TrEMBL record:
GO terms for cellular component: extracellular region. Its EC number is 3.2.1.4. GO terms for biological process: cellulose catabolic process. Belongs to the glycosyl hydrolase 45 (cellulase K) family. It catalyses: Endohydrolysis of (1->4)-beta-D-glucosidic linkages in cellulose, lichenin and cereal beta-D-glucans. Keywords: Carbohydrate metabolism, Cellulose degradation, Glycosidase, Hydrolase, Polysaccharide degradation, Signal. Disulfide bonds join C13-C136, C14-C49, C18-C87, C33-C57, C88-C200, C90-C190, C157-C168. This is Cellulase. Transmembrane segments: none annotated. The chain holds residues 22 to 234 of 293 of the full protein. It is an enzyme of class 3 (hydrolase). One of its GO terms (molecular function) is cellulose binding. The active site is at D12 (nucleophile).
C-alpha cells in the first residue's frame, strides 16, 4: 500500500488490535504487556480496555534516530486494506505539512485506526490522548491531558510513568508538537528496530522494498 493520508496522535494503553491471534499472516501477534510493561507471550489475555489486564507495551513508543528520521508505531485504517493486510506491516511516512514537513517516520502498524480521510495513521505517542477508551486509567491511574490530543505542555510529561516519558517528550522534541501533520506513505520491509519490540513480522514483509534511511 502507498498513497497520502492524515495523521492524529494517541495513546490509550489498550491492548493493540494486532496483538490478537488470527488477525493477519504473521509469525506471532504484537506483544502486549502487563500493567508494568512485562511482555505477555499469552495472546489470549484480555485487553485492559475490556476489563482485562493486557496493555500497550511502553516500547511501542517513537524515537528519533537523527534530525531527519524517527521510528515508531501507529494504528492504521487504509483504503482498500483490512486488518489482515496492515497488521504488523511497516510504512515510511514523509510528512507534507506542519513543522515536521519533509521529515521521515517509519512506523509499524500495531492496531486499527478509525476512518479519517483516505488513509488514517493514528501515531503512537504517550500523552497524545486516550480518545474513546481510557485504558491508562485502569493500567496505572491515568495519564494527564485532554481526552483528544492529550497533554499540551512538555512539562506534563514529568509525571508520566518512567517508561512512557521518552515517547511523551519525543512528541515535543523531534516531532515539534506537530498538530496532525499530513504525509505520504509507502509500505516497506520492517526495520528490525520495530519487530524486535513487537515480536510481530508479516509473512509478506519481503514483498515490499527495503527502507533506506
Ligand atoms: O479519533 C482519532 C484520534 O483522535 C485524537 O484526537 C485528535 C482529534 O480527534 C482531532 O479532532 C484533533 O484535531 O487532534 C487530536 C489529536 O490528534 C485522539 O487523541 C486519539 O485518541 C484518537 O484515537
Amino acid at each position: 500500500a502507498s498513497g497520502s493520508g492524515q495523521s492524529t496522535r494517541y495513546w490509550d494503553c489498550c491492548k493493540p488490535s494486532c496483538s490478537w491471534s488470527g488477525k493477519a499472516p504473521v509469525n506471532r501477534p504484537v506483544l502486549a504487556c502487563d500493567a508494568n510493561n512485562n511482555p505477555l507471550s499469552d495472546a489470549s489475555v484480555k485487553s485492559g480496555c475490556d476489563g482485562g489486564s493486557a496493555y500497550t507495551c511502553a516500547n511501542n513508543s517513537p524515537w528519533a534516530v537523527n534530525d531527519q528520521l524517527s521510528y515508531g508505531f501507529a494504528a492504521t485504517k487504509l483504503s482498500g486494506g483490512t486488518e489482515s493486510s496492515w497488521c504488523c506491516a511497516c510504512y515510511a511516512l514523509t510528512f507534507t505539512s506542519g513543522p515536521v514537513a519533509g521529515k521521515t517516520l517509519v512506523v509499524q502498524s500495531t492496531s486499527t485506526g478509525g476512518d479519517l480521510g483516505s488513509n488514517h495513521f493514528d501515531i503512537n505517542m504517550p500523552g497524545g490522548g486516550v480518545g474513546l477508551f481510557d485504558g491508562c486509567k485502569r493500567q496505572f491511574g491515568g495519564l494527564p491531558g485532554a481526552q483528544y490530543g492529550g497533554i499540551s505542555s512538555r512539562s506534563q510529561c514529568d509525571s508520566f510513568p518512567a517508561a512512557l516519558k521518552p515517547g511523551c517528550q519525543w512528541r515535543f522534541d523531534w516531532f515539534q508538537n506537530a498538530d496532525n501533520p499530513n504525509f505520504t506513505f509507502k509500505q516497506v520491509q520492517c526495520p528490525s528496530e520495530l519487530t524486535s519490540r513487537t515480536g510481530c513480522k508479516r509473512n509478506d514483509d519481503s514483498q515490499f522494498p527495503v527502507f533506506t534511511p
